Every structure is written in C-alpha cells, then in structure tokens.
C-alpha cells in the first residue's frame, strides 16, 4: 500500500504566475479568471498586519503582471474574496478542465502540485489533519500552489497554499479564500491545535488489512458510537461522525464486518497495544489512507 | 519532506490503449510509433511458453486496435524489439515531448504513471531495487504503464511494466524491451535474488532528516570507510563507494556533518535499532530517496 497522487496534467495546464512589484506567486487560471493569494499585493513592511482593503484600493488592473510561462495575460478586472484575489483576464484558458471548488473535511486526502514561479516542480498526496494543517513540503515561493482530487475527469480544487507554521506544518485556504482552521494571512507565528489521530482512516486501514487476509485483531464484541467516541478521545483519537460511518459503508459491505464491530476491534487495540504483532507489515497504525484510497488501491 | 513524483502531464498525453483479440494493455505513443509489451499478442493458451516471433509473424496490421481516447489510430507497420512491440501508426502524436530512452542503475529513482485501459490513474515515486525489482502499486491491466524522470522539459523514459512477482513486488523492462533482472515474460511464478538496502540513499535521507530539524540519531563517533562497509555488509546493506561519498558532499557541506560521521550514526542505528523512535515519521530506515532527490526537494 502506498501514497498515490492523481495525475497532475489537468492542473499543470492551469498554473500561471502573478507578480506585483517584485513579489511573484502562483495562480490558477480557469476560464477567464486567475485565482491567487491576496498577499501578492503586500510589500515587506505591510505584512505584519496588513490592511488588505486599503492596499487594494491603491491597486489598478495595470499593476498586475499575469504570465503563462513568458506570455503576458492582460488583466481587465480585479476583486478580493476572503483571502484570495480574483483577476479577470482577457483570454479564456483553453486547457480549463471540468472543475469544482470544494471545501474538504479533516481526514480527507488530496494531491498537491508544488509550483515555483508558475512552474510545476512535483506532486504528492497530503491529508488534512484534524487541527486543519497539512504535513506538506513547501519552500519559499510556493504560495498559490493548489491541492485537488480528480473524479471521472472533473477536478475538485480544495486547497491553496499560504503559510508554514513554526512547527513545520502548513496552512492554507479553500478556493473561495477561507482558511482551514484558525489561521490568518499575516507574517506572524501562529499555533495549531494539538493534533489527533484520524480515526476514520485508521478504520479504513484495518479494513484493508482484512481484505488482504490479516485479521487476527477482529473480535466478537461490538460498541455504540457514543461509547467508542468517549474512549477514542482518551487516546487522542478523533471522534467518529455520521458521515464517517457512511463512507466506511462500501468497505463494511465488501468484508461483511459491521462498522461498529470494527470500532470495538480498534478499541481493544487502543487499550492493549499491538503485542509486537503487526498489521499489514507494520507496528504503527496508518491514518492518512481514506476509505476511497483503500478501494482505489483494490 | 515527502516522497515527491514528477508532474506527469507530459507523459499523460502519450498514453494509449492497445488491443489484440481479447487482450488489452497500455501503450506509449511517441511521434508516429506506439510502444507496448509484446505479450498483448498472446492468448491464454500461449502464455506459458510463447514463441513470440512465431506468434508475431502470424499477425496482421489490422489485428492491432490502437485507441487514443475515443479516436482509433491505424497501424501501418509493426516490429519487435526484445520484449517490446513497436507499432507504426499513420498519425503523429502532437503532444510528444522532447524525450530519451535510458536504462537506470539500481538505487536510482523514477516516477511511475499507473494507467488502465490507456487512461492515467495515479503517479508515485519508485526506486530500482538492487535485485532489479520495484515495490510498486499495479493491478490487472496495468502492463505498459511507464516510469520516467524529467529534466528541463526532457522526459527520460526508463521503465515499462510487465509483471507482479508472487511476493507482490514488480518487474519490467527498459524501453528497448530488455528486462531489469533475471525475469522473463512468461506466465510463471518467478522469484528475485535476495534484496539489499540502498546505503547511499539511507544516508541521503538521514541528511534530509537533519535539514528538517531532526538530530536525535547523530552521535560523536566517527568511522573509516572500510569499517562502515564491513558492518553494512553484515546487515545486508550495499557497500558505500568513494563515488557515493563525493555525491553526498553537497549535503554534508550544507549541514556541516562529515559523511563518515553520518556513517557512524547509521552504524549505531543498525547495531542498536531505533528503539521505537521515529525519523521523518517513519519507524524504518528509508532507502528510496537519492541524494539528488533530497537536494531537489530541500532546495
Ligand atoms: C514572523 O512570522 C513568522 C514566524 C514564524 C513562522 C512564519 N511563517 C510565516 C509564513 O508562512 N508567511 C507566509 C506569508 C504570509 C503573509 C501568509 C509565507 O511566507 N508564505 C510562503 C510559503 C512559506 C514560505 C516557506 N514555506 C512556507 O510554505 C509564500 O509562498 C508566500 N510568500 C510571500 C512573499 C511575499 C508576499 C506574499 C507571500 S506568500 C510567517 C511566519
Ligand atoms: C502462474 O503464473 C504466475 C504465478 C505467480 C505470479 C505471476 N505473475 C504473473 C504476471 O505478472 N504475469 C504478467 C503476464 C506475463 C505474460 C508477463 C501479467 O499479468 N502482467 C500484468 C500486470 C500484473 C497483473 C497483476 N499486477 C501485476 O502488475 C498485465 O498487465 C498484463 N496482463 C496481461 C494479460 C494477458 C496478456 C498479457 C498481459 S500483460 C504471472 C504469475
């Protein structure tokens, strides 16, 4: 089992650069609109606590340099939506895929196309942590790179990159400019909530183990959702939601193991440890494979 | 620090479907030629001991059905190169990138674009193991998927997929159709030679751990190159050459840790273990990052 990204070509065709003064970041060109982080308009001395409304009043369409490679796209309008700038340009992107903007939940995974100066550098799979950070790999100049899923040729954009916390994890917004978690776009040290283990993904991993014949950990007990959630919190595990139970449905049907029966199996693992026995060849439970990732790889 | 693949768009525009009779697998369309595994011509009976040149002489151009998306491309010729079939078509691929065919060395990495029915499914990073297998993720119908590196808009193709061993690892060929390793395109259960760990890559990765602010495994000791190699061979690690030491130089300079000092740290980890501690989130020593991979990501 491995972390697999989606093929990135449909997103590569949409990356451009956006420059104000000497500040260049990545933007996303869809139809005739370019989306990018609003702090492209910030000077170094306004970053501590910028006045974005006041900074944007001073800007005009002709202050924005938008380039696809070396080709300039003329800007004919601009607006701000939360923490993203929307630049209307005079050309509709001929490589625009079928697409949606979506806001994901903690535990969901997505692919990140890491870009520098509008040019793709690499692709990898990330999971949104319960404290709304991602464990990414981003350098200076990566802001504006996006994360996405692809379903039947439709790209669902879910992440745009804005910042690196002092602990080395990353934070950003959806494509409507709303941050995931309690962060703000200022040059300031911010801290995330203490992280927790993604319970729904650990259960998906147990299902994958069963599918491959590794099932020693199954037991004859069951539990209520509420009883399991109260126990999980004592072990720094996320509580399960109704949506979590539902996305485990296909794996539950495939193995014949009820979701609440698998919860009682995980609950025994939590109170007693693994006893040096492994699951799928590991002493550690994996929590960054979603139920969809598991059926993707089968 | 994550396992990072190359962006796959330049390869996506080359993937097609090839069908013969009831068999379907993926092909690579470059200019006017489609490359695919030759056993697309095999029927089920043929699989065990196919005489390929004999089976190929009995095929006509019109037996090959090549599809790019919804469009069919007409085969105007065909030839075989080792385990790869080369189908000449009447249309040139306009999305053909600049490219080259290369044979990689054990321990080098590449990106794999997994495809089914000519459609890209996922992309991830693999290393050519010392025993010439790869620990990939491939299901039925993945044959013909390719592995590649990218350098300044030039795509270097190095792997085409052919089989899964009983142990679950994978085997394939370069784009001239020669297998990596002692494998053969027969429907038989085949075993690989005993694998070993890629030592220069483990060292590159420990350096990455330092760059990302993790130092719990460093120590005050030092070792000679030969004495490290004796312990490494004991633990089934490949020997470390002076070429590898030089290669790690940029990394050593960056962190101020001499190569043989980092070797002393790896020696202790091999002799004492990790004691349930973690490195970059892993409980095991990672060996599928090359020194180039580390430099490219960290800077
Ligand atoms: C004293 O303040 C700190 C204390 C402790 C940790 C800290 N982290 C950050 C922080 O992240 N700032 C944001 C920017 C702010 C405005 C969101 C930022 O630099 N984003 C980067 C990606 C970063 C860089 C390293 N790899 C990460 O992913 C990015 O690309 C952008 N660059 C610029 C350059 C100019 C103008 C806009 C942008 S946006 C500040 C900070
Ligand atoms: C008693 O035989 C075994 C015993 C123990 C383990 C074994 N493994 C294999 C084995 O791998 N065979 C090759 C095929 C051989 C000819 C190279 C094969 O199936 N390749 C797959 C990719 C495979 C499938 C599962 N995931 C992997 O990646 C592929 O796509 C192709 N399918 C066909 C189907 C028909 C015709 C051509 C192709 S080519 C056989 C075998």
Q: Is B160 exposed, middle or buried (0-12, 13-18, 19+ CB in 10 A)?
A: buried
DSSP code of B51? -
- Give the Cα separation of B172 and B183 in Å (integer): 8
Domain assignment of residue A262, given as a range = 199-297
DSSP code of A282? B
Instruction: Give contacts of B121 with chain A, Cβ < 8 Å.
Output: 7
Provide CB contacts within 8 A for A248, sequence distance 6+: A200, A203, A204, A207, A259, A262, A291
- Give the Cα separation of A38 and B228 in Å (integer): 53
Q: What angle do CA B180, B182, B187 make, to 5 degrees?
A: 100
Instruction: Give the 3-state secondary structure of residue A28.
Output: strand
CA of A97 to the centre of ligand 1 (A): 30
Report resolution in angstroms.
1.9
Is the CB of A141 inside a 6 Å radius of any atom of ligand 1?
A: yes
Ligand nearest to the CA of B27: 2
| Among protein residues, the one whose CA lies closest to atom 1 of ligand 2 | B188
Instruction: Give contacts of A121 with chain B, Cβ < 8 Å.
Output: 7
- The alpha carbon of residue B214 and the mean position of all alpha carbons in its chain are separated, in whole angstroms, by 29
User: Which residues have a C–N gap over 2.5 Å right after them in chain B?
Assistant: none
Is residue B265 within 8 Å of B219, Cβ to Cβ? yes
Q: Are A7 and B122 in contact (CB < 8 Å)?
A: yes
H-helix or E-strand spanning residue A76: strand A75-81
* A86 in reach of chain B (CB within 8 A): no
Provide CB contacts within 8 A for B154, sequence distance 6+: B97, B98, B99, B100
User: Which residues have a C–N gap over 2.5 Å right after them in chain A?
Assistant: none
Is residue B186 within 8 Å of B49, Cβ to Cβ? yes
Q: Which among A7, A122, A135 has CB closest to B120?
A: A7
* A6 in reach of chain B (CB within 8 A): yes
Please confirm, yes or no, whether B162 is among the known catalytic residues: no
Cβ atoms within 10 A of the Cβ of A109, count?
23
Is residue A156 within 8 Å of A6, Cβ to Cβ? no
* B114 in reach of chain A (CB within 8 A): yes
Query: Residue holding tokens 């690989």?
Result: B192
- Give the Cα separation of A157 and A96 in Å (integer): 13
Is the CB of A43 inside a 6 Å radius of any atom of ligand 1?
A: no
Q: Of A84, A71, A60, A96, whose CA–CA distance to A17 is shortest?
A: A71
CA of B284 to the centre of ligand 2 (A): 30
Q: Is A79 left (phi over 0), alpha (psi -120 to 50) or beta?
A: beta
CA of B141 to the centre of ligand 2 (A): 9
Instruction: Give the 3-state secondary structure of residue B13.
Output: coil
Is the CB of A167 inside a 6 Å radius of any atom of ligand 1?
A: no
CA distance B226 to chain A (A): 33
CATH number at residue B269: 1.10.1840.10
Q: Of B12, B199, B209, whose CA–CA distance to B97 is shortest?
A: B12
Instruction: Give the 3-state secondary structure of residue A75.
Output: strand
CA distance B112 to chain A (A): 10
* Helical residues (DSSP H) of A117-235, grouped into ranges: 199-211, 225-234
Best of B1, B6, B8, B126 to mutate (most A CBs within 10 Å, chain A):
B8
Q: What angle do CA B114, B119, B121 make, to 5 degrees?
A: 40
Instruction: Give contacts of A122 with chain B, Cβ < 8 Å.
Output: 4-7, 297
* Helical residues (DSSP H) of B182-222, grouped into ranges: 199-211
- Give the Cα separation of B254 and B215 in Å (integer): 14
- Give the Cα separation of B108 and B287 in Å (integer): 10
- Give the Cα separation of A178 and A172 in Å (integer): 8
Is the CB of B37 inside a 6 Å radius of any atom of ligand 2?
A: yes
Size of interface A-B (CB pairs under 8 A): 76
| Among protein residues, the one whose CA lies closest to atom 26 of ligand 2 | B139
Q: Which among A9, A136, A284 has CB closest to B12?
A: A9
What Cα–Cα distance (Å) separates residue A42 from each residue in A58, A146, A192, A266, B4? Answer: 12, 20, 24, 49, 31
* A292 in reach of chain B (CB within 8 A): no
Q: Are B297 and A123 in contact (CB < 8 Å)?
A: no
Q: What pairing do the DSSP bridges indicate for beta strands B109-116 and B33-37?
A: unpaired
What Cα–Cα distance (Å) separates residue A267 from each residue in A231, A255, B175? Answer: 7, 19, 50
- Give the Cα separation of B8 and A154 in Å (integer): 17
Any idea of the CA torsion for A153, A154, A156, A162, to the nearest 10 degrees?
70
- Give the Cα separation of A164 and B14 in Å (integer): 36
- Give the Cα separation of A194 and A188 in Å (integer): 19
Instruction: Give the 3-state secondary structure of residue A214.
Output: coil
Instruction: Give contacts of A120 with chain B, Cβ < 8 Å.
Output: 7, 9
Give pairs for A68-72: CB < 8 Å, separation 24+. A68/A16, A68/A29, A68/A118, A69/A118
- Give the Cα separation of A209 and A200 in Å (integer): 14
Provide CB contacts within 8 A for A258, sequence distance 6+: A222, A252
- Give the Cα separation of B251 and B266 in Å (integer): 16
Q: Is the dihedral of CA B71, B77, B81, B83 positive or negative?
A: positive
Is the CB of A150 inside a 6 Å radius of any atom of ligand 1?
A: no
Is the CB of A166 inside a 6 Å radius of any atom of ligand 1?
A: yes
Ligand nearest to the CA of B169: 2
Instruction: Give contacts of B5 with chain A, Cβ < 8 Å.
Output: 5, 122-124
* B95 in reach of chain A (CB within 8 A): no
Q: Is A129 exposed, middle or buried (0-12, 13-18, 19+ CB in 10 A)?
A: buried
Which tokens sit at A170?
Answer: 């990353």
Q: Are B299 and A120 in contact (CB < 8 Å)?
A: no
Q: Is A34 exposed, middle or buried (0-12, 13-18, 19+ CB in 10 A)?
A: buried
Catalytic: which of B39, B161, B162, B170? B39
Is the CB of A47 inside a 6 Å radius of any atom of ligand 1?
A: yes
What Cα–Cα distance (Å) separates residue B166 from each residue in A251, B138, B170, B178, B189? Answer: 25, 13, 9, 21, 6
DSSP code of A105? P
- Give the Cα separation of A159 and A173 in Å (integer): 6
- Give the Cα separation of A126 and A290 in Å (integer): 11
Q: Is A53 exposed, middle or buried (0-12, 13-18, 19+ CB in 10 A)?
A: exposed
Q: Of B96, B89, B88, whose CA–CA distance to B31 is shortest?
A: B96
Which string of b and e fits B132-157 if b means at least 16 CB within 10 Å? bbbebbbeebbbbbbbbbbeeeebbb
Q: What pairing do the DSSP bridges indicate for beta strands B154-164 and B98-101?
A: parallel
DSSP code of A180? S
- The alpha carbon of residue B170 and the mean position of all alpha carbons in its chain are separated, in whole angstroms, by 9
Q: Which among A1, A8, A284 has CB closest to B8?
A: A8
* A296 in reach of chain B (CB within 8 A): yes
Which tokens sit at B252?
Answer: 């050593």
Cβ atoms within 10 A of the Cβ of B226, count?
9
């Amino acid at each position: 089992f491995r972390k697999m990204a989606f093929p990135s070509g449909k997103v590569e065709g949409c990356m451009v650069q956006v420059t104000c003064g000497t500040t260049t970041l990545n933007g996303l060109w869809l139809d005739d609109v370019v989306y990018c982080p609003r702090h492209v308009i910030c000077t170094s001395e306004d970053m501590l606590n910028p006045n974005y409304e006041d900074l944007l009043i001073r800007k005009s369409n002709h202050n924005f340099l938008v380039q696809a490679g070396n080709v300039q796209l003329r800007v004919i309008g601009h607006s701000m939506q939360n923490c993203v700038l929307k630049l209307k340009v005079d050309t509709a992107n001929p490589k625009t895929p079928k697409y949606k903007f979506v806001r994901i939940q903690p535990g969901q995974t997505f692919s990140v196309l890491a870009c520098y100066n509008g040019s793709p550098s690499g692709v990898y799979q990330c999971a949104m942590r319960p404290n709304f950070t991602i464990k990414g790999s981003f350098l200076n100049g990566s802001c504006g790179s996006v994360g996405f899923n692809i379903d039947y040729d439709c790209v669902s954009f879910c992440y745009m990159h804005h910042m690196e916390l002092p602990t080395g994890v990353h934070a950003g917004t959806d494509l409507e400019g709303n941050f995931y978690g309690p962060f703000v776009d200022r040059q300031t040290a911010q801290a995330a909530g203490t992280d927790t283990t993604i319970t729904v993904n650990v259960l998906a991993w147990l299902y994958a183990a069963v599918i491959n014949g590794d099932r020693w950990f199954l037991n004859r007990f069951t539990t209520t959702l509420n009883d399991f959630n109260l126990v999980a919190m004592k072990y720094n595990y996320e509580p399960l939601t109704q949506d979590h139970v539902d996305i485990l449905g296909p794996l539950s049907a495939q193995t014949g193991i009820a979701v609440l029966d698998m919860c009682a199996s995980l609950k025994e693992l939590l109170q007693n440890g693994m006893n040096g026995r492994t699951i799928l060849g590991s002493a550690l439970l994996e929590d960054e494979f979603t139920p969809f990732d598991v059926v993707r790889q089968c």
